[PDB]
Amino acid sequence: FTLIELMIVIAIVGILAAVALPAYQDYTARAQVSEAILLAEGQKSAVTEYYLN
Amino acid sequence: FTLIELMIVIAIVGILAAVALPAYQDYTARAQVSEAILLAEGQKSAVTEYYLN
Numbered sequence: 001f002t003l004i005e006l007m008i009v010i011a012i013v014g015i016l017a018a019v020a021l022p023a024y025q026d027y028t029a030r031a032q033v034s035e036a037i038l039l040a041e042g043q044k045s046a047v048t049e050y051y052l053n
Numbered sequence: 054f055t056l057i058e059l060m061i062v063i064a065i066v067g068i069l070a071a072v073a074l075p076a077y078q079d080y081t082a083r084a085q086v087s088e089a090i091l092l093a094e095g096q097k098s099a100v101t102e103y104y105l106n
Contacts, residue, residue, distance in 0.1 A: 024054060031056040038063030044070050
């Protein structure tokens with residue numbers, strides 16, 4: 001008879017999270033890799049010097 | 054969503070080393086030659102004397 005505004009809007013936020021799930025999941029991974037890269041670098045110094053010397 | 058400050062600054066130090074690479078590599082060579090020159094000299098004495106005598 002009535003109450004569908006609460007039911008649909010709770011189910012659009014539910015599906016909104018499902019659509020926002022893979023975006024945050026590669027943005028996220030892509031973020032965790034960007035650090036492996038920062039940890040890898042800064043060690044270029046040692047390696048560069050060792051090679052040139 | 055976020056983490057690009059760590060990713061770019063690890064990648065600017067990486068490219069900074071690549072730009073600082075040829076500068077240290079001729080400054081370096083130019084330094085190793087400046088010695089071949091010092092080792093060559095100081096032997097001028099012997100040679101000069103031998104010639105004048």
